[PDB]
Amino acid sequence: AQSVPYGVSQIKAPALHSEGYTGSNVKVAVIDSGIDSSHPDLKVAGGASMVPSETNPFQDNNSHGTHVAGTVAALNNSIGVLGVAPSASLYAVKVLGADGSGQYSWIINGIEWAIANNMDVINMSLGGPSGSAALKAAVDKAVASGVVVVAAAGNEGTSGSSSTVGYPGKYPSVIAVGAVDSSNQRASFSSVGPELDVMAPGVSIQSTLPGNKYGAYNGTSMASPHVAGAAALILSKHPNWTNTQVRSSLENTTTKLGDSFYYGKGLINVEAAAQ
Numbered sequence: 094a095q096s097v098p099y100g101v102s103q104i105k106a107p108a109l110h111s112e113g114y115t116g117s118n119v120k121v122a123v124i125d126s127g128i129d130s131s132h133p134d135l136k137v138a139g140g141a142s143m144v145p146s147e148t149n150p151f152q153d154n155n156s157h158g159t160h161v162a163g164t165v166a167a168l169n170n171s172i173g174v175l176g177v178a179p180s181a182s183l184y185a186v187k188v189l190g191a192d193g194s195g196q197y198s199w200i201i202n203g204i205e206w207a208i209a210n211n212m213d214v215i216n217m218s219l220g221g222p223s224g225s226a227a228l229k230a231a232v233d234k235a236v237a238s239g240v241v242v243v244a245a246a247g248n249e250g251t252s253g254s255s256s257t258v259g260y261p262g263k264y265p266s267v268i269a270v271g272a273v274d275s276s277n278q279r280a281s282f283s284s285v286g287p288e289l290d291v292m293a294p295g296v297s298i299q300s301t302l303p304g305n306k307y308g309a310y311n312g313t314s315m316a317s318p319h320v321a322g323a324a325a326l327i328l329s330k331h332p333n334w335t336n337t338q339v340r341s342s343l344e345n346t347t348t349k350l351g352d353s354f355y356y357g358k359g360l361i362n363v364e365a366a367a368q
C-alpha cells in the first residue's frame with residue numbers, strides 16, 4: 094500500500110494532483126549524497142558524481158540524498174510513499190561522500206553541471222557556516238541562468254538577535270527554507286534570520302532510504318525538498334513562468350505564521366502559488 098506523507102498534504106500538493114499537475118517534464122537536480130537507483134519507489138532520469146572518491150551518483154552511501162529525493166518525487170504507485178511532484182525528472186548530482194561531507198569545489202562543480210544540463214530546479218539540502226566568493230558566483234550564475242535554487246536554512250536554531258542561516262541559504266538569490274512541525278510551529282532546531290524566506294514541514298518526514306527501505310528524518314534538509322517539489326508543480330502548470338515568478342508566487346501565497354525573523358513569509362501553499 095502507498096502512503097501519502099502528511100508533509101505532502103500540509104502544503105496542499107494533492108490539490109494540484111487532482112487538477113492533473115504532478116510536475117511532468119520538469120528537470121529537478123538533487124545536489125546531495127547521491128540517489129539509490131535500486132529503489133523501486135524512485136525513477137531517476139540521470140546524474141553525475143562530483144566526488145572523486147565515489148564516482149557513481151546512483152550509489153547513496155549516506156542515505157541523505159535518497160531521503161530528499163523521495164520527498165521531491167517518490168512515485169505514484171502501489172508502494173511506499175508519494176512525492177510532492179511524482180512526475181518530475183530527477184537528477185542525481187552527488188557532491189557529498191559517505192560521511193555527509195563535501196568540499197566546496199565539489200558542490201560548485203555540481204551546481205555547474207546542473208546549469209549546463211538545463212535543470213529547472215536545484216535543491217541543496219546542505220549548509221555550511223561559511224560562504225566563499227566561488228560558492229556565491231555559482232549560485233548567482235544558476236539564478237541568472239533561470240534555475241530556481243532552493244536550500245535548507247540550517248539546523249542551528251536561534252542565537253539571540255543573530256542570523257543562524259547557513260550557506261548557501263544565506264545568499265539573497267537562494268530560497269532558504271526553515272522547518273515547521275504538523276502544527277505549523279517552528280522546529281526548535283530550525284535556523285533563523287533576515288535571510289529565512291519560507292517554511293515547510295521538517296519534522297518526522299517519512300521518505301525513501303537506500304536498499305528499498307523507508308524511514309523518518311527531522312531537519313531543514315527535509316523541509317527544502319518540499320519547496321523544490323512545489324516549484325516543479327508550479328512549472329508543470331506554467332511552463333512559461335521564469336524563476337523570478339515561481340519564487341515570487343511561492344512567497345506571496347504563503348500562510349503567514351509568526352514573526353518573519355523566525356518564519357520568513359510563512360508556510361508555502363502550492364495550490365495558491367500555482368495559479
Ligand SMILES: [Ca+2]
Pocket residue numbers: 095134167168169170171172173174175
Ligand atoms: Ca509510491
Ligand SMILES: [Ca+2]
Pocket residue numbers: 262263264265266267268269288289290
Ligand atoms: Ca535567501
